[PDB]
């Protein structure tokens, strides 16, 4: 490969678990809670750090 | 103490036995399937069959088979030739029974499963590759397919193109037609004949006539030449020998030895070998050569084998011929025939001086003749050869359709018209 951004950096390859990964077709709405799970972890954190900026 | 004991049954399968003194007993069921029993469409099947001995069968799973013999320290060898297929089975006195029941499953109850047979396949390549490392095997093989047309011209190793194509009904068919009662001969080196028979009677009664493969013989002169990059070149020059267990044959054998150069001394050179002397004188420093002699049921192959370097190929090749022509011109003194003879006789005896040797010798005889000829008798026959007789045979190579096979850089290897 040449200038395939993704696998060029080794780091950026590690991020291709989001984009290129095998994901089953059929899949209830239930699985979105994984992702949202992370969403919440990131929101609490940003929020926490600002509150702990005045607590 | 007790000598062997043959017994032909109603089926026509032979069985022998010798309760020996020593600790180790060895059975070996010799079925009459050689490579010669396959057709254009069936080539390579014995090969795979030979390699598929430890697969699941009706009463014992590949795992039990292997682990079982291991349990007791047993060995299971499955040997074949162009004419026959010896299925050997060694183990300790006490464990024959556990072992025998193994030999019987492997041979009468094979279950070639699509999946199992399939994983083997690749083994064929690995096996072919390791035996094609000795020039002798590819040349010696090339020889048989040049010299024959149809049956014995089939090689022992599966043809490259066939490998993965060996199908389970093929294996099943081959066993069914060839692994039968009339073609079988049990042989024990430390078992009771009385108990052997019983078992034989209980497990070896299957029907199947000969030649459902397409039996028949035929000789055709021909040359197979394989170019290489190797310094050394090997070639074989051979004419229709006499057939198996016949006088002519026997004569050949004696003749073979008058020229026959299988060193009897480490680091030692033959003084006796005519071929070697004659070749030697007209030949360079490094080289080696020897008398080839093959005998089968319906045909033979006699002649020599050479190993020369690039430029010396012809010189050696002709040299060897010329010398064997000498014997055919009549030039052969009594003193050399008797030496020969004794050489032969000594060899055959040492051949049978071991369990493994004896067991082969015996089974071998049971598929040809139908009984065991004792050594002595054997010895007598070889002696009956006339000094002339030998010459006469020899006369036949020089005046018998040529058939050669060589390998390496063939700039300097005579063709048929060259010699």
């Amino acid at each position: 490969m040449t200038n395939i951004r993704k696998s060029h950096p080794l780091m950026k390859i590690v991020n291709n678990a989001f984009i290129d990964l095998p994901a089953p077709s059929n899949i209830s709405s239930w699985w979105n809670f994984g992702s949202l799970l992370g969403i919440c972890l990131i929101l609490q954190i940003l929020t926490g750090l600002f509150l702990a900026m005045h607590y | 103490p007790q000598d062997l004991e043959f017994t032909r049954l109603p089926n026509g399968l032979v069985i022998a036995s010798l309760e020996n003194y020593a600790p180790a007993s060895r059975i070996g069921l010799f079925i009459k399937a050689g490579s010669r029993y396959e057709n254009s469409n069936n080539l390579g099947t014995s090969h795979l069959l030979r390699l598929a001995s430890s697969l699941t069968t009706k009463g014992a799973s590949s795992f039990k088979i292997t682990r079982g013999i291991e349990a007791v320290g047993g060995k299971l060898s499955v040997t074949s030739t162009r004419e026959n297929m010896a299925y050997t089975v060694e183990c300790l006195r006490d464990d024959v029974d556990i072992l025998m029941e193994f030999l019987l499953n492997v041979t009468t109850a094979p279950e070639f499963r699509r999946w199992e047979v399939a994983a083997l396949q690749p083994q064929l390549r690995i096996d072919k590759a390791v035996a094609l490392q000795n020039p002798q095997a590819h040349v010696i093989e090339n020889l048989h397919a040049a010299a024959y047309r149809n049956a014995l011209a089939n090689s022992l190793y599966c043809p490259d193109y066939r490998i993965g194509k060996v199908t389970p009904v093929e294996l099943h068919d081959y066993v069914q037609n060839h692994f039968t009662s009339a073609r079988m001969a049990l042989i024990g080196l430390g078992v009771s004949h009385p108990v052997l028979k019983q078992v034989a009677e209980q497990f070896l009664n299957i029907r199947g006539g000969l030649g459902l493969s397409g039996a028949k013989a035929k000789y055709h002169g021909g040359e197979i030449r394989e170019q290489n990059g190797d310094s050394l070149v090997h070639a074989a020059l051979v004419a229709e020998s006499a057939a198996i267990g016949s006088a002519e044959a026997n004569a050949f054998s004696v003749l073979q030895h008058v020229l026959g150069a299988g060193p009897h001394v480490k680091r030692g050179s033959n003084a006796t070998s005519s071929l070697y002397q004659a070749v030697a004188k007209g030949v360079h420093q490094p080289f080696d050569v020897s008398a080839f002699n093959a005998s089968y049921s319906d045909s033979g192959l006699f002649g020599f084998y050479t190993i020369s370097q690039a430029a010396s190929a012809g010189d050696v090749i002709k040299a060897a011929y010329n010398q064997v022509k000498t014997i055919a011109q009549g030039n052969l003194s009594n003193p050399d025939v008797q030496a020969a003879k004794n050489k032969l006789k000594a060899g055959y005896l040492m051949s049978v001086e071991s369990s493994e040797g004896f067991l082969d010798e015996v089974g071998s005889q049971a598929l040809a003749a139908g009984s065991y000829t004792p050594p002595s008798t054997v010895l007598q026959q070889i002696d009956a050869v006339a000094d002339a007789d030998v010459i006469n045979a020899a006369k036949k190579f020089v005046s018998g359709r040529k058939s050669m096979a060589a390998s390496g850089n063939l700039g300097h290897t005579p063709f048929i018209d060259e010699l």
């Binding site: - | 309760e19 003194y21 020593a22 600790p23 180790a24 390699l51 001995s53 430890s54 590949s62 795992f63 088979i65 292997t66 682990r67 291991e70 349990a71 007791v72 320290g73 047993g74 060995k75 299971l76 060694e90 183990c91 300790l92 006195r93 006490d94 690995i126 096996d127 390791v130 009771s192 009897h264 001394v265 480490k266 680091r267 030692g268 050179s269 033959n270 003084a271 006796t272 030496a339 004794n342 050489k343 032969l344 006789k345 000594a346 060899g347 005896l349 040492m350 001086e353 071991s354 369990s355 493994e356 040797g357 050594p375």
Partner: protein
């Protein structure tokens, strides 16, 4: 009917006998056609000094090319026309020449052999003809990884000792070697008691004994002044010798832990141990189902091409280990399984497993003895090795005392916390660092 044990006890005992000079006579009778008479001299490579390192091996090329009685090709012609074969083998501890021959041929057999040992017509021409040959054999032995590697092993586990030298010897010692030097060699080491005249088959001991041409004897001391061990211990060293040649297609690795002399109770128990690990090749028919893990793993995972465990037995030294040939990328995995098999063995042996190996042993040790040649070599070598006993029926007994705890405790002496002898002829790029192979011999984890 007859049962293993029985057979065992029924076997023809070996008769050991002595001439006035110490010529040892042994023989096992069977009243059979062919006979293999042999003279098993025990002055090997390990007596050679740096110069005559390849001395003995040189004599072996001359052994069969003339006696003052039997000149140029008189030996061969004689053997041949009988139909007898004549072989000479040489070891780092044992030289031996034997004849295979019709039993009626003893008369001129034993004469020949005897002749051979003593009178060897060796002219300058034969010396300069052999040199060239030797130098050419050497070149050809460099073409064999297995032979190249096993030499290495010895040299590194014997670094700094007479024993570490090739039996083939130094290249240039062949060139240099003085014609006078083969004499002193022979003269000093072919003197029995060393020698043994052994034989098996259809002969009567009585006649062997008598037949022995009582021509020259041991020109040595009657007292302890001789007792200065010519068999002086050879210092044990755990080092590795790594000779990397990425040019070569495969990789040979011989890994060893020093072991017992020829005679020792621990020395049969070891065997039973290696029975278990076993030995394996690309062409074994059992592969994945074979009961020894290294084999199964190997078979299964295409781990290696071929592997064999060995027990090399010398009077004061012993090489123990296995040897595996494996692609460049699999050197470490096979190291891991192997060493792994060792440790598991000295801590977790199970009676089942040791009982299977046991039985393997018996067979290996009975089946070898099939044939005349075999028996003869066991009888000859057995006498300089283990002294004048023929432990054949004992074996089963000794082998019988084997217990899973016996096997475990004996294996732990030699392998556990011991420092390995490792050599390879690369692709050794992936060959484990000496410290890694070291820590492989103790169990924290892995």
């Amino acid at each position: 009917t007859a049962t293993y044990a029985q057979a065992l006890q029924s076997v023809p005992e070996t008769q050991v006998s002595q001439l006035d000079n110490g010529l040892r006579v042994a023989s096992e009778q069977s009243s059979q056609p062919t006979c293999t008479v042999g003279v098993w001299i025990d002055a090997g490579s390990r007596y050679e000094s740096e110069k005559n390192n390849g001395a003995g091996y040189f004599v072996e090329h001359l052994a069969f090319k003339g006696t003052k009685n039997r000149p140029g090709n008189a030996l061969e012609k004689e053997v041949e026309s009988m139909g007898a074969h004549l072989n000479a083998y040489s070891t780092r501890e044992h030289t031996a020449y034997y004849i295979k021959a019709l039993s009626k041929d003893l008369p001129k057999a034993v004469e020949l052999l005897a002749d051979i040992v003593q009178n060897c017509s060796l002219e300058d021409s034969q010396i300069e003809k052999e040199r060239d040959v030797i130098l050419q054999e050497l070149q050809e032995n460099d073409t064999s990884m297995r032979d190249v590697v096993f030499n290495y092993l010895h040299a590194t586990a014997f670094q700094g000792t007479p024993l570490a030298q090739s039996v083939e010897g130094p290249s240039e010692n062949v060139r240099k070697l003085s014609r006078a030097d083969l004499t002193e060699y022979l003269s000093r080491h072919y003197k029995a008691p060393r020698m043994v005249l052994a034989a098996a088959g259809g002969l009567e001991h009585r006649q062997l004994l008598d037949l022995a041409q009582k021509h020259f004897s041991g020109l040595s001391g009657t007292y302890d002044e001789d007792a200065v061990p010519t068999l002086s211990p050879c210092r044990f060293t755990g080092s590795q010798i790594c000779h990397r040649e990425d040019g070569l297609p495969l990789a040979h690795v011989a890994i060893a832990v020093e072991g017992p002399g020829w005679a020792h109770p621990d020395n049969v128990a070891l065997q039973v141990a290696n029975a278990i690990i076993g030995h394996y090749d690309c062409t074994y028919g059992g592969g994945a189902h074979l009961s020894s893990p290294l084999a199964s793993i190997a078979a299964t995972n295409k781990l290696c091409q071929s592997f064999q465990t060995f027990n090399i037995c010398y009077a004061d030294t012993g090489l123990l280990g296995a040897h595996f040939v494996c692609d460049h990328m699999s050197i470490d995995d096979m190291m891991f399984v192997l060493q792994g098999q060792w440790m598991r063995l000295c801590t977790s042996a199970t009676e089942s497993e040791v009982l299977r190996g046991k039985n393997l042993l018996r067979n290996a040790l009975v089946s070898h003895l099939d044939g005349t040649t075999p028996v003869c070599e066991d009888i000859g070598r057995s006498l300089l090795t283990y002294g004048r006993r023929i432990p054949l029926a004992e074996w089963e007994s000794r082998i019988a005392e084997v217990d899973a705890r016996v096997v475990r405790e004996v294996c732990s002496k030699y392998f556990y916390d011991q420092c390995p002898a490792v050599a390879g002829f690369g692709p050794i790029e992936q060959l484990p660092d000496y410290n890694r192979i070291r820590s492989g011999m103790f169990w924290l984890r892995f």
